[PDB]
Design a binder for this molecule. Structure first.
Ligand code: CHL
Ligand code: CHL
Ligand code: CHL
Ligand code: CHL
Ligand code: CHL
Ligand code: CHL
Ligand code: CLA
Ligand code: CLA
Ligand code: LUT
Ligand code: LUT
Lengths: 220, 238, 219
């Protein structure tokens, strides 16, 4: 395994030698040679698309975590009102309000306007500092700053920094694909994805996705 | 100058202006005479060039050849779809006992009691499990679609869109240069027509919920009452 | 401001490096927002500028054509169906499509003939946009002039560029408003000035969060 250069692990393996793009060399992390749609021909579109991919990846990682750890954590102990992720916004409208750990003494969140207003105000300057400038650094790598973001300092040697970049982008593409799976298997079942996992593990042959295949057929 | 039998096109030997209307700058365009500025990269050397890149997505030539690949593959898939959507309904109106001949409900036939009878016959396919069907589909399609991009047992160094060797042109219609260049634009025009018609199949299945041949019969019976506008009130937001 | 390298940008004070190098301030409303890089190629930039201004003018025309029957329902003429997402059903009524509630003014019956006359006029006037015609011939396809400006407000080029950036800013606000009309028609089911009447009745409950629950699957 190399993850760079011309002999890299590619998305079709043996079927990837004639498909492989001429604009897609072995430079950037995660380049499996997959631009069959042709959307990275000029390098600044590829730069904005790599930035888009890494930001969507790093958001979908924490999105999958905030998806399954309420449901798993409610399965272990610590019961909630609406433990599933895609009813989790409805806990503001509850008579007891959204709570972080469910207990009544933490936050007492009854307002949706205050939370949304505060997070918009703080993330305006946060994502603006992400775009350019900021007190933690201005002219760094805009996708991989480091410095005031690395208390442990795992970007010391360029070899382990490069392999951390490729496992970052691979875990993030897995998280984006699985978050797409969370999105679609929420709406075809109406039930939680960990509860979908136990439903699949109870009956693998007939409680799979194909039981919900006749659901979306149009009426009349 | 020109006599009557040449204007009808009796003699297929002296036809050299046949590709002049589909290739080169003096070809037909998308808005006809109401399309003056053809995009300067769509020079007409490719089949299906009606000068239409209004959204400008195909200015770069690499993106343009990838979009040409996607267009021809989607064209052939939609051609096979629009032939394979109506023909169960055509054979059900024939009298062959297909039990759910509409295409948008044919996938649920494998969840029946007797499985998936192919032409309504247990002597045919009679597939029960959707799981082994999708498994052999993903194995066979992985092999075929991986052979497609970089060659394989049916041609290795051939063209990625038009191989035409001993396996993909076995009848040999594309031996001639001009006949191949004419049937290329014939192929992509039939494929764009079938892509438009498959989009029509999708929207017609969504908003009506009946068969496309049932939609054709309900438009042939009442054209002015049973148009697309009598189902325009079906997505009103209450 | 509004042109050149020292113009108004989309992040404002935090917009000195995120703006792309190919978005130089010569075209109207160049706030430097190409965060997906889709207009990096100049032909993509020109075609997307054409799509943006045409979508802009169609959106502002659609915004006024959607809200003015609502303001006239406030004013007092009832209408065949004031609600813009139920406005197409006037031609399906028994009395037909009366324009201002007047049965002797339009009284349209056939929706198929309305679509036929509509496509026969609109295909011609949309194909005339590309390569001139009776109005113009070979002008700027985004800013023709000389037949669609009977008053002719494009005299001074500084005021012409000012009106250009004013047009494209009103147009981005208009597509914003039409997207809002689209996604608050489907979640509420009431007209947009009627949603304004709800939000002015009680401002803290008649929000989008009153209807933020209705799109859960729930088996
Ligand atoms: C040699 C065999 C081989 C095959 C068959 C594949 C298969 C694939 N790999 Mg690959 N790989 C292979 C070798 C290898 N891969 C990888 C590592 C990777 C990675 C990291 C990735 C891939 C990805 C892909 C996909 C890219 C093409 C595509 O998008 O399909 C398009 C066609 C389909 C997806 C059809 C299959 C689905 C199904 C049959 C149809 C569904 C029908 C629905 C019912 C219709 C929907 C209903 C409507 C109403 C919405 C494809 C599925 C990419 C991927 O996972 O994308 C999802 C990807 O990110 N591979 C390695 C390690 C180096 C390989 C080693 O040899
Ligand atoms: C991060 C993205 C995000 C997404 C996709 C959602 C969507 C959801 N919210 Mg949530 N929210 C999100 C963040 C936020 N919400 C809220 C405030 C609320 C409230 C008060 C409520 C919800 C509810 C819901 C859930 C059910 C509503 C629905 O239509 O289900 C169908 C849709 C899905 C299951 C998601 C499918 C994916 C999505 C359609 C595509 C994602 C791409 C988007 C187009 C991009 C949008 C983000 C933009 C702004 C950058 C669903 C999980 C309701 C709920 O939980 O009760 C049942 C509810 O009452 N949200 C705040 C403040 C957020 C901060 O960002
Ligand atoms: C000082 C204010 C400030 C605040 C409140 C944030 C807030 C955030 N940044 Mg950050 N940033 C801030 C300054 C800056 N950011 C960045 C560049 C980035 C990047 C590339 C990313 C973030 C991401 C994040 C999020 C994850 C927390 C984190 O970075 O762990 C430490 C969080 C919303 C991540 C994100 O949004 O995905 C979840 C992300 O990928 N920031 C730069 C450029 C050097 C900054 C300049 O000072
Ligand atoms: C000179 C007159 C002339 C006109 C007006 C057109 C018109 C058109 N041709 Mg062209 N052609 C013309 C001459 C010629 N064409 C062709 C050969 C072709 C081909 C091969 C193709 C075209 C296509 C097109 C379309 C390209 C633009 C588009 O996609 O519009 C799209 C927008 C509209 C059509 C308007 C929207 C429809 C409706 C009126 C409004 C919406 C109504 C709904 C009720 C809205 C409700 C929906 C809600 C829910 C959202 C356009 C309709 C392409 C096509 O068919 O694309 C569809 C195409 O592939 N033409 C030749 C032979 C050389 C011509 C010779 O003179
Ligand atoms: C200094 C602070 C400052 C910041 C941080 C921004 C940044 C912004 N400006 Mg701005 N500007 C700022 C000052 C100025 N601007 C401008 C001129 C402009 C213009 C002309 C424009 C902007 C626009 C924008 C927006 C572009 C990014 C975006 O689309 O949001 C992306 C992030 C989100 C959408 C997150 C939304 C928040 C919330 C989480 C949503 C809730 C999520 C849902 C619940 C989930 C959905 C559920 C399911 C069902 C799908 C953003 C708010 C553009 C705009 O308005 O686009 C909309 C625009 O056209 N600015 C000027 C004049 C010089 C400024 C003065 O200083
Ligand atoms: C392209 C702009 C355009 C858009 C976005 C729409 C979209 C709409 N039309 Mg409309 N139309 C449009 C142009 C046209 N329509 C119509 C003829 C109709 C009819 C007859 C009806 C609609 C209806 C609708 C609405 C229902 C769809 C929805 O989800 O809510 C919605 C406002 C329906 C409606 O208003 O609900 C009662 C309806 O019955 N439209 C014609 C004449 C050919 C148009 C011309 O281009
Ligand atoms: C990689 C993350 C991941 C994981 C762990 C799961 C796991 C699961 N999904 Mg989710 N899903 C995913 C990704 C994932 N899916 C993605 C990317 C999509 C979008 C296409 C979906 C869409 C989806 C729907 C719509 C549904 C599920 C369901 C399920 C459950 C039953 C399995 C099933 O029906 O197959 C569905 C699997 C897919 C559609 C594709 C997933 C990709 C896999 C990893 C590749 C196939 C490998 C497989 C082991 C070999 C199959 C052999 C043969 C059948 C072809 C199971 C818990 C069902 C459920 O809730 O059960 C109760 C259900 O209704 N999933
Ligand atoms: C009617 C549409 C149509 C047309 C005109 C063409 C035309 C062409 N194709 Mg394309 N093709 C199409 C549809 C079409 N194709 C579809 C749908 C597929 C996918 C199955 C393909 C797959 C394909 C490949 C893989 C190759 C071609 C090749 C060719 C060329 C020579 C073969 C020929 O002349 O066929 C003329 C076509 C007809 C006369 C249509 C007859 C339709 C029959 C009677 C119906 C049978 C339907 C059948 C059951 C479908 C399942 C198979 C020519 C440019 C070859 C080439 O370029 O060689 C240099 C080549 O390599 N095409
Ligand atoms: C590569 C290629 C190649 C060639 O070119 C072709 C093509 C095809 C074009 C391409 C492809 C592409 C793709 C695949 C894409 C996809 C994407 C995705 C899916 C994403 C997701 C993505 C996803 C995502 C982000 C998600 C996210 C999420 C988040 C943040 C959040 C979450 C959450 C949480 C925490 C919790 C709570 O309670 C809820 C919520 C709120 C919900
Ligand atoms: C040109 C241009 C130009 C400018 O400038 C810009 C723009 C506008 C962007 C552009 C345009 C574009 C377009 C139009 C697109 C469209 C497409 C389509 C429609 C496709 C289809 C597509 C379609 C398709 C694929 C289809 C396919 C089909 C198939 C597979 C099959 C199916 C089937 C069958 C047999 C039946 C059974 O039972 C089942 C199934 C399975 C269901």
């Amino acid at each position: 395994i190399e993850w760079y250069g011309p002999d890299r692990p590619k998305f079709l393996g043996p079927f990837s030698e004639g498909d492989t793009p001429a604009y897609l060399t072995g430079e950037f992390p995660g380049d499996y040679g997959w631009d069959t749609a042709g959307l990275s021909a000029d390098p600044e579109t590829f730069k904005r698309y790599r930035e888009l991919e890494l930001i969507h990846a790093r958001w979908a990682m924490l999105g999958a975590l905030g998806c399954i750890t309420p449901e798993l954590l409610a399965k272990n102990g610590i019961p909630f009102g609406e433990a599933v992720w895609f009813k989790a916004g409805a806990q503001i409208f509850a008579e007891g309000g959204l709570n972080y750990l469910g207990n009544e003494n933490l936050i007492h969140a009854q307002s949706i306007i205050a939370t949304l207003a505060f997070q918009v105000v703080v993330m305006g300057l946060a994502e603006a500092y992400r775009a350019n400038g900021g007190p933690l650094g201005e002219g760094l790598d805009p996708l991989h700053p480091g410095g005031a973001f690395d208390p442990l300092g795992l970007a010391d040697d360029p070899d382990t920094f490069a392999e951390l970049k490729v496992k970052e982008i691979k875990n993030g593409r897995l998280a984006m694909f699985s978050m797409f799976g969370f999105f679609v298997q929420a709406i075809v079942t109406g039930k939680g994805p960990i509860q979908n996992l136990d439903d699949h593990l109870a009956n693998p042959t007939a409680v799979n996705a194909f039981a919900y295949a006749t659901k979306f057929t149009p009426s009349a | 100058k020109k006599t009557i039998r040449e204007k009808a096109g009796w003699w297929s030997n002296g036809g050299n202006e046949k590709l002049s209307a589909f290739y080169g700058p003096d070809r037909g365009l998308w808005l006809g005479p109401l399309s003056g500025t053809t995009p300067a990269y769509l020079t007409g050397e490719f089949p299906g060039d009606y000068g239409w890149d209004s959204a400008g997505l195909s200015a770069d030539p690499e993106t343009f050849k990838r979009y040409r690949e996607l267009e021809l593959i989607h064209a052939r898939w939609a051609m096979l779809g629009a032939l394979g959507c109506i023909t169960p309904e055509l054979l059900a109106k024939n009298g062959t006992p297909i039990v759910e001949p509409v295409w948008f409900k044919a996938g649920a036939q494998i969840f029946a009691e007797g499985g998936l009878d192919y032409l309504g016959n247990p002597g045919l396919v009679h597939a029960q499990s959707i799981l082994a069907t999708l498994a052999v589909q993903v194995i066979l399609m992985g092999a075929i679609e991986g052979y497609r991009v970089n060659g394989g047992p049916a041609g290795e160094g051939l063209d990625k869109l038009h191989p035409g060797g001993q396996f993909f042109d076995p009848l040999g219609l594309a031996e001639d240069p001009d006949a191949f260049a004419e049937l290329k634009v014939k192929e992509i025009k039939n494929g764009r027509l079938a892509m438009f018609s498959m989009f029509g199949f999708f929207v017609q299945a969504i908003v009506t919920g009946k068969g496309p041949l049932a939609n054709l019969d309900e438009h042939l019976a009442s054209p002015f009452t049973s148009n697309a506008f009598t189902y325009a009130q079906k997505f009103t937001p209450q | 401001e509004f042109y050149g390298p020292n113009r108004a940008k989309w992040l404002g004070p935090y917009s000195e490096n995120a703006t792309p190098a190919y978005l130089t301030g010569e075209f109207p409303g160049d706030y430097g927002w190409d965060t997906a890089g889709l207009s990096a190629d100049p032909e993509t930039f020109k075609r997307y500028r054409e799509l943006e201004l045409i979508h802009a003018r169609w959106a502002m025309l659609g915004a006024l054509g959607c809200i003015t029957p609502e303001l006239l329902a406030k004013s007092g003429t009832q209408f065949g169906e004031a609600v813009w997402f139920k406005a197409g059903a006037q031609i399906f009524s028994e009395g037909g499509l009366d324009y201002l509630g007047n049965p002797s003014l339009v009284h349209a019956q056939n929706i198929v003939a309305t679509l036929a006359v509509q496509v026969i006029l609109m295909g011609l006037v949309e194909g005339y946009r590309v390569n001139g015609g009776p109005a113009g011939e070979g002008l700027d396809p985004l800013y023709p002039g000389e037949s669609f400006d009977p008053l002719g407000l494009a005299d001074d080029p500084d005021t012409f560029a000012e009106l250009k950036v004013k047009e494209i800013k009103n147009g981005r606000l208009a597509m914003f408003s039409m997207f809002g009309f689209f996604v608050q028609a489907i979640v509420t089911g009431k007209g947009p000035i009627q949603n304004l009447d709800d939000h002015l009745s009680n401002p803290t409950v008649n929000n989008a969060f009153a209807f933020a629950t209705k799109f859960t699957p729930s088996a």
